[PDB]
Design a protein around this ligand. Sequence first.
Ligand SMILES: COC(=O)CCCCCCCCO[C@H]1O[C@H](CO)[C@@H](O)[C@H](O)[C@@H]1O
Ligand code: NI
Length: 158
Amino acid sequence: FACKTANGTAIPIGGGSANVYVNLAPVVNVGQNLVVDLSTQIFCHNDYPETITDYVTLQRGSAYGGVLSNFSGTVKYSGSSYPFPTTSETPRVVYNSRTDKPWPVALYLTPVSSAGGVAIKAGSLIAVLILRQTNNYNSDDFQFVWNIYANNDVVVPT
Ligand SMILES: COC(=O)CCCCCCCCO[C@H]1O[C@H](CO)[C@@H](O)[C@H](O)[C@@H]1O
Ligand code: NI
């Protein structure tokens, strides 16, 4: 089991960390969502699907910077929704193929009332999503840590 990003880097077998940049709508109002869909960017695969089944959860989601300070959030993981920042590890998703399959995670972020002006700075860390991977074969239990960075400023119209 390993993962890689759409158009950049990889986390190899055994886990590790990687930095991911996301495009964000440049203007969002109170009551509207920024949708950050990571399933078009993070892809994982099972390296031995014939003998091993891999299990993948969103172990934890954390907010940082302007997201932590200026937005309220939910996370969608494989068809279900949760508070973001998360309050516990999610059910698991099965990886059973050598073909790349998306990691099905998306954030829905909505500005809080106190947000106004540049609520998220270009280049700043906005979230960390931890992918935890185990299997039905041995005691492997690995973390794939995705630091999510804002590509651009996001403005909440005052
Ligand atoms: C009875 O013999 C076997 O079951 C050997 C099966 C082929 C060798 C498998 C060696 C271990 C491969 O491990 C990697 O690939 C596995 C499958 O993706 C992951 O579950 C592991 O965590 C790790 O990422
Ligand atoms: Ni591989």
